[PDB]
C-alpha atoms as an extended CHARMM CRD file, in Angstrom:
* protein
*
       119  EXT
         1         1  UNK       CA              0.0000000000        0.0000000000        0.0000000000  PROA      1               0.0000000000
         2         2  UNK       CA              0.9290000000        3.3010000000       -0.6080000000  PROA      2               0.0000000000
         3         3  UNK       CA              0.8270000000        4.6290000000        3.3140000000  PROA      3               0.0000000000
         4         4  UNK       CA              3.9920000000        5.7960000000        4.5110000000  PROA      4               0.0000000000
         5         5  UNK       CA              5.5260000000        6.4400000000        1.1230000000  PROA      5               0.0000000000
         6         6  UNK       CA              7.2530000000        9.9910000000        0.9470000000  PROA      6               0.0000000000
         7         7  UNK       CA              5.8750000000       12.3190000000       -1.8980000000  PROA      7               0.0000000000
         8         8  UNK       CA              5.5070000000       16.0070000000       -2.9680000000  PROA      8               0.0000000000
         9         9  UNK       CA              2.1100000000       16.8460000000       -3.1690000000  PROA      9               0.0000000000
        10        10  UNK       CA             -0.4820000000       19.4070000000       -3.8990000000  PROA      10              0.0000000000
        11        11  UNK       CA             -1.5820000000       22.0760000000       -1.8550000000  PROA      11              0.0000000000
        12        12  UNK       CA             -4.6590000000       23.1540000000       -3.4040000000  PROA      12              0.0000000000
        13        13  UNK       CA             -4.8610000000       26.3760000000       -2.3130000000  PROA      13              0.0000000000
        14        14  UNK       CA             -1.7930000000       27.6580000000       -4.0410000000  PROA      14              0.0000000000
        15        15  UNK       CA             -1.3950000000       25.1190000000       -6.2440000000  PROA      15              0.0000000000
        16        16  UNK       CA              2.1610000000       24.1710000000       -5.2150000000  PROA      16              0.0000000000
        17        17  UNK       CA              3.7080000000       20.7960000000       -4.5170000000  PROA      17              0.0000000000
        18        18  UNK       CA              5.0070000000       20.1770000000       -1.2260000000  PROA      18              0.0000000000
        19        19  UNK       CA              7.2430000000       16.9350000000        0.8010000000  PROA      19              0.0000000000
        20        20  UNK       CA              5.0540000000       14.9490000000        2.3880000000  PROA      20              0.0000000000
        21        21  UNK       CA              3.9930000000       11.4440000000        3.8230000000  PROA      21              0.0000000000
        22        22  UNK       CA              0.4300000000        9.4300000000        2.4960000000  PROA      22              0.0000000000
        23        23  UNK       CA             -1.1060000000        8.8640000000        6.0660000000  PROA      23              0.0000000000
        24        24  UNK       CA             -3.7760000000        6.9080000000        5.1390000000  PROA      24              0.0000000000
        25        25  UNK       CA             -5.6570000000        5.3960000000        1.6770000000  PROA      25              0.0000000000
        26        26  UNK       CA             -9.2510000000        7.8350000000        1.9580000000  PROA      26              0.0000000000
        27        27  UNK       CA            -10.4750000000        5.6180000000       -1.0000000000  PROA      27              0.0000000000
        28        28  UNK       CA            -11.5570000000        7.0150000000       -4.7080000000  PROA      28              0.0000000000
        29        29  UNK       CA             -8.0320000000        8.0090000000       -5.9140000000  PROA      29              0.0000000000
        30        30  UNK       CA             -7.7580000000        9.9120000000       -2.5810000000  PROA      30              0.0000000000
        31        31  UNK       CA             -5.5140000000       10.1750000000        0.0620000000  PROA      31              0.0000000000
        32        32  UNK       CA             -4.3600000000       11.7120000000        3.5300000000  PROA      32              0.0000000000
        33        33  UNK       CA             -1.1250000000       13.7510000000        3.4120000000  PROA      33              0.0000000000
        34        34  UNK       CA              0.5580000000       14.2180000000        6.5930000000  PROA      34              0.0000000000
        35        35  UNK       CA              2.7190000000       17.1160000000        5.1920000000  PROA      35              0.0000000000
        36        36  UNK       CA              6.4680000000       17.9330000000        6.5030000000  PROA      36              0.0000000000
        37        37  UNK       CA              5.5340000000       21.5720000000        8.1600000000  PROA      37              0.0000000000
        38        38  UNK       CA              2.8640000000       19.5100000000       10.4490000000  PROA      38              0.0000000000
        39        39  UNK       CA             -0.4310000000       20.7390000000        7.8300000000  PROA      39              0.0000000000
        40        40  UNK       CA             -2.8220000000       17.5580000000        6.6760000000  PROA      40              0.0000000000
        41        41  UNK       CA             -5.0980000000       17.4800000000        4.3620000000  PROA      41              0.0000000000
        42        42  UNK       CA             -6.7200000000       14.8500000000        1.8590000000  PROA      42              0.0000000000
        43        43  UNK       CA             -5.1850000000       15.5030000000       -2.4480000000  PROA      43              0.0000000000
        44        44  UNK       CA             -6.2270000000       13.3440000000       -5.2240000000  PROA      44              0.0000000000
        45        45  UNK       CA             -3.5390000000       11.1050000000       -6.2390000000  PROA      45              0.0000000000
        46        46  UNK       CA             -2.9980000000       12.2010000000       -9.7250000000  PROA      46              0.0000000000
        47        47  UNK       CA             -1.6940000000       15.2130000000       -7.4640000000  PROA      47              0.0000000000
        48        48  UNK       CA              0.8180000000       13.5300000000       -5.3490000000  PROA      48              0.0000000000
        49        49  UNK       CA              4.0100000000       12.6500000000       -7.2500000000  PROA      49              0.0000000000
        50        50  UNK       CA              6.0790000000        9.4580000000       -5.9710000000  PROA      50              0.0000000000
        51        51  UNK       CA              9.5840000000       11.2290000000       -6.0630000000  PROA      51              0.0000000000
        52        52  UNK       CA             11.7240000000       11.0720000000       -3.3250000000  PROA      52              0.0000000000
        53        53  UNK       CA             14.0700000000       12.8400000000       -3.8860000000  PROA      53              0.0000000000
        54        54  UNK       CA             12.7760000000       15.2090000000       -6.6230000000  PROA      54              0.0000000000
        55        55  UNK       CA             14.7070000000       14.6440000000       -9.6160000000  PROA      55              0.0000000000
        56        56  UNK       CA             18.4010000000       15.6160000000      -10.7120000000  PROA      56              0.0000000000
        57        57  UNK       CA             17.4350000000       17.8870000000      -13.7610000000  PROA      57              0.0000000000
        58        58  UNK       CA             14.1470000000       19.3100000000      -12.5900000000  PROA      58              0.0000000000
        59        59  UNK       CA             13.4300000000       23.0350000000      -12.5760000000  PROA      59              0.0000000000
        60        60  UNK       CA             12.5200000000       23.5340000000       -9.0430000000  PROA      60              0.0000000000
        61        61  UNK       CA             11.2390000000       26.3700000000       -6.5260000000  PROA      61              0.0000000000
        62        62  UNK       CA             13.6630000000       27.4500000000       -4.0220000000  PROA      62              0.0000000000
        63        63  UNK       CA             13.2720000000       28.9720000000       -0.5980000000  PROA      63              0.0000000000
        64        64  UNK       CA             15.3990000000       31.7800000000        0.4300000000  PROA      64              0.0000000000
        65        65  UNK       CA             15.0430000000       31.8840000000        4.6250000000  PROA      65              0.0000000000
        66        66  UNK       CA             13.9510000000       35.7570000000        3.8740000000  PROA      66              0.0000000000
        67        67  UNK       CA             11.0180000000       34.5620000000        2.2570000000  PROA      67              0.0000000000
        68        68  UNK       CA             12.2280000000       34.8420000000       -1.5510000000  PROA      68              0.0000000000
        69        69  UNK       CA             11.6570000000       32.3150000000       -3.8550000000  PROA      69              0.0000000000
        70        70  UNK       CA             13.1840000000       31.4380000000       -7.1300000000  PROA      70              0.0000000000
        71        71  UNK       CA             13.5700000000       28.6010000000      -10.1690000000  PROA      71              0.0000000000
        72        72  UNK       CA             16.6830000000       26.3710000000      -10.0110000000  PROA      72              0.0000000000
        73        73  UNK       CA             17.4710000000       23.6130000000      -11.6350000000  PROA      73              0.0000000000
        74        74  UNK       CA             18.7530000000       20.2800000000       -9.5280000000  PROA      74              0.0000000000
        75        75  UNK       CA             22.2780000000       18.8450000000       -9.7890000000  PROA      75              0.0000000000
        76        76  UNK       CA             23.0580000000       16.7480000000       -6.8570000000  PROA      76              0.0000000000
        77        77  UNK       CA             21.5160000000       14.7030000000       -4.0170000000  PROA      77              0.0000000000
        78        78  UNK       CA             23.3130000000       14.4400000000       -0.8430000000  PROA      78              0.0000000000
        79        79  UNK       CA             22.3030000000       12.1060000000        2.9940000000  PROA      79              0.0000000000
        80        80  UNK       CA             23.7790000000       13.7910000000        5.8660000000  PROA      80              0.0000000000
        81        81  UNK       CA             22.6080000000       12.1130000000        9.1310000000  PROA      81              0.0000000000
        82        82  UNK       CA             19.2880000000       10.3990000000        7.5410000000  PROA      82              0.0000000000
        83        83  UNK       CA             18.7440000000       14.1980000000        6.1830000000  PROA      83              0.0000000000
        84        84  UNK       CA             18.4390000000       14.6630000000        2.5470000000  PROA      84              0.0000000000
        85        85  UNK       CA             20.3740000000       18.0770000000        0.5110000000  PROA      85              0.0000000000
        86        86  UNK       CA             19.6690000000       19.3470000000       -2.6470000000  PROA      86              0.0000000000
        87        87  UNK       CA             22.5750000000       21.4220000000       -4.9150000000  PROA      87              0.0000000000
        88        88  UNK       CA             20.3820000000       23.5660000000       -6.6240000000  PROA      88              0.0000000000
        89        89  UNK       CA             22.1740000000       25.5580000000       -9.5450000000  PROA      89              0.0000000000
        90        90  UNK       CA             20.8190000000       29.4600000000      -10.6130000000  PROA      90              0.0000000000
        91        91  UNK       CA             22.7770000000       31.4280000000      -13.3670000000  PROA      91              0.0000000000
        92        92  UNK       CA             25.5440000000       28.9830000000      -12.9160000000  PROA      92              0.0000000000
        93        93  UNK       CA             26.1440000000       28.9150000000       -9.6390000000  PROA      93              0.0000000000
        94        94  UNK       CA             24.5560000000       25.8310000000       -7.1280000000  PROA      94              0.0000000000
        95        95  UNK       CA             23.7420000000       26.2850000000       -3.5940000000  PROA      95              0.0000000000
        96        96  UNK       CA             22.8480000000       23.6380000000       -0.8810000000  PROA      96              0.0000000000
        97        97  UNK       CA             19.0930000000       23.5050000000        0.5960000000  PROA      97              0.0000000000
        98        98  UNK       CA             17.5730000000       21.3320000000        2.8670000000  PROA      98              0.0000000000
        99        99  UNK       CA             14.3750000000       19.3860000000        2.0510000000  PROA      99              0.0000000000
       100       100  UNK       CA             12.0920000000       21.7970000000        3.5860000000  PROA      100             0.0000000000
       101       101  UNK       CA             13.5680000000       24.5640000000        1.2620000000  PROA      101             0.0000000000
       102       102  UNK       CA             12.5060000000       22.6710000000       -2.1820000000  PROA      102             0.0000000000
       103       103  UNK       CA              8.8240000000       23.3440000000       -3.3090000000  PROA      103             0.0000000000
       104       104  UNK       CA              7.4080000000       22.3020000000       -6.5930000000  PROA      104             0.0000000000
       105       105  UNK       CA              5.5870000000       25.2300000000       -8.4780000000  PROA      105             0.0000000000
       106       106  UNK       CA              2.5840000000       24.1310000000      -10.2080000000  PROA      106             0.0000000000
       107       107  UNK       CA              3.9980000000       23.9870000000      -13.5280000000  PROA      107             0.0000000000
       108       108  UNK       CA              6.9050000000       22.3380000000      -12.0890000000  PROA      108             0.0000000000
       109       109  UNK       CA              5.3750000000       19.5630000000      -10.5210000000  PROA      109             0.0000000000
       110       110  UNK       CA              2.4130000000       19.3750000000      -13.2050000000  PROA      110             0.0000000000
       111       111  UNK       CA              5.5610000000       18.2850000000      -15.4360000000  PROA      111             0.0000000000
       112       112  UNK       CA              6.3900000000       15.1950000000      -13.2550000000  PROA      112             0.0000000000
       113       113  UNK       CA              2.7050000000       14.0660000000      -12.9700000000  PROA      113             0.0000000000
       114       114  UNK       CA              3.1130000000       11.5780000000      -16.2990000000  PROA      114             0.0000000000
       115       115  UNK       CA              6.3080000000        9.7570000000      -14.9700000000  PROA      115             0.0000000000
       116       116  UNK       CA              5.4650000000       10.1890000000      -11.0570000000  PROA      116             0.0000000000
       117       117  UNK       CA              1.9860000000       10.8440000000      -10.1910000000  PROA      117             0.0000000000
       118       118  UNK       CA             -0.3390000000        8.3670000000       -8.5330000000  PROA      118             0.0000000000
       119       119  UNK       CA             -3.2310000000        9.1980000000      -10.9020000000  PROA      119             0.0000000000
């Protein structure tokens, strides 16, 4: 079954994909997403992509801790004490992020849906 898995899924109300957990199988193509900043809520699984990590290659959203945002594109993967690190590379230059610092937009993650969703 597909509880426990780790995903980035849809948050509806902005329409950006966030890391998250499937807490429980709601029935109908939906499910419970325990998300990773504590919020739950039930998405559609043709809105939850099955990539942990995201991608190498992917344009992604990343989170400044002032509260900009910006595309990057993803170039490395790194564990560090069970915690996961992307490089993220802007106009050339890559700089490290944690997990909770990588959001999908939704163009971004609706390009993953056809190789990673669970629609």
């Amino acid at each position: 079954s597909f509880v426990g898995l780790r995903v980035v899924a849809k948050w509806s109300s902005n329409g950006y994909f966030y890391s998250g957990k499937i807490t429980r199988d709601v029935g109908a193509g939906k499910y419970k997403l325990l998300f990773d900043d504590g919020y739950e809520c039930d998405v559609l699984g043709k809105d939850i992509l099955l990539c942990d990590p995201i991608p190498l290659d992917t344009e992604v959203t990343a989170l400044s801790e002032d509260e900009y945002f910006s595309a990057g594109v993803v170039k490395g993967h790194r564990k560090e004490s069970g915690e996961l690190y992307y490089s993220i590379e802007k106009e050339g230059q890559r700089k490290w992020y944690k997990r909770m610092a990588v959001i999908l937009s939704l163009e971004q993650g609706n390009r993953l849906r056809e190789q990673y969703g669970l629609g």
